[PDB]
Amino acid sequence: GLYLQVGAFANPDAAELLKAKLSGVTAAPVFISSVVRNQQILHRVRLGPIGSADEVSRTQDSIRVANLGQPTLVRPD
Ligand SMILES: CO[C@@H]1O[C@H](CO)[C@@H](O[C@@H]2O[C@H](CO)[C@@H](O[C@@H]3O[C@H](CO)[C@@H](O[C@@H]4O[C@H](CO)[C@@H](O)[C@H](O)[C@H]4NC(C)=O)[C@H](O[C@H](C)C(=O)O)[C@H]3NC(C)=O)[C@H](O)[C@H]2NC(C)=O)[C@H](O[C@H](C)C(=O)O)[C@H]1NC(C)=O
């Protein structure tokens, strides 16, 4: 299973808003993974698992068309 990260935010409201926006551009599960990093809480907006590289590429394209960020492959944390 393949995963994308679309953004990482200190503001949880920004992360939740991006998660909601992404649900309108992809059918893959969208979730927030929040971690302690550099003495702060970081809210990572992620999606997956995606079943194939081709679907990852098309999902990246749809996120860029929606101007929602520069999505990068991440391995699940
Ligand atoms: C190889 O290392 C990895 O590189 C990744 C490169 O993509 C990196 O991920 C990125 O991390 C940056 C921070 O380091 C993160 O940047 C946030 O960027 C957004 C813009 O997209 C900021 O949001 C905007 O802020 C302005 C004002 O500053 C607002 O006016 C505007 O409305 C905001 N936009 C939205 C949509 O709300 C955001 O700042 C806001 C203020 C916030 O924190 O709430 C930036 N956050 C921070 C904390 O600086 C960027 O989104 C992220 N990109 C992706 C695709 O995830 C990896 O780092 C992240 C943190 C991670 O590790 O998960 C690098 N990994 C490591 C281990 O170093």
Residue numbers in the entry: 266 to 342
What do the authors say?
In order to characterize how the SPOR-RlpA domain interacts with denuded PG, we solved the X-ray structure of the complex with compound 1. Co-crystallization and soaking were both performed in parallel and resulted in two structures for the SPOR-RlpA:1 complex at near-atomic resolution (1.30 and 1.48 Å, respectively). The two structures are identical (rmsd of 0.16 Å for the 77 Cα atoms); the description provided herein is for the 1.30 Å resolution cocrystallization complex. The opposite face (convex face) of the SPOR domain does not present any of the features observed for compound 1 interaction, thus pointing to a single PG-binding site per SPOR domain, consistent with the mass spectrometric data. The high-resolution data for the SPOR-RlpA:1 complex allowed us to map all the amino acids and water molecules involved in glycan-chain recognition. (ii) Notwithstanding that all four saccharides interact with the protein, interactions are not evenly distributed among the four subsites. (v) Main-chain interactions are essential in PG stabilization by SPOR domains. (vi) hydrophobic interactions are observed with F274 and L307. In agreement with our mass-spectrometric experiments that clearly noted the absence of binding of compound 5 to the SPOR domain, the crystal structure of SPOR-RlpA:1 reveals that recognition of the carboxylate moieties of muramic acids at positions 1 and 3 is crucial.
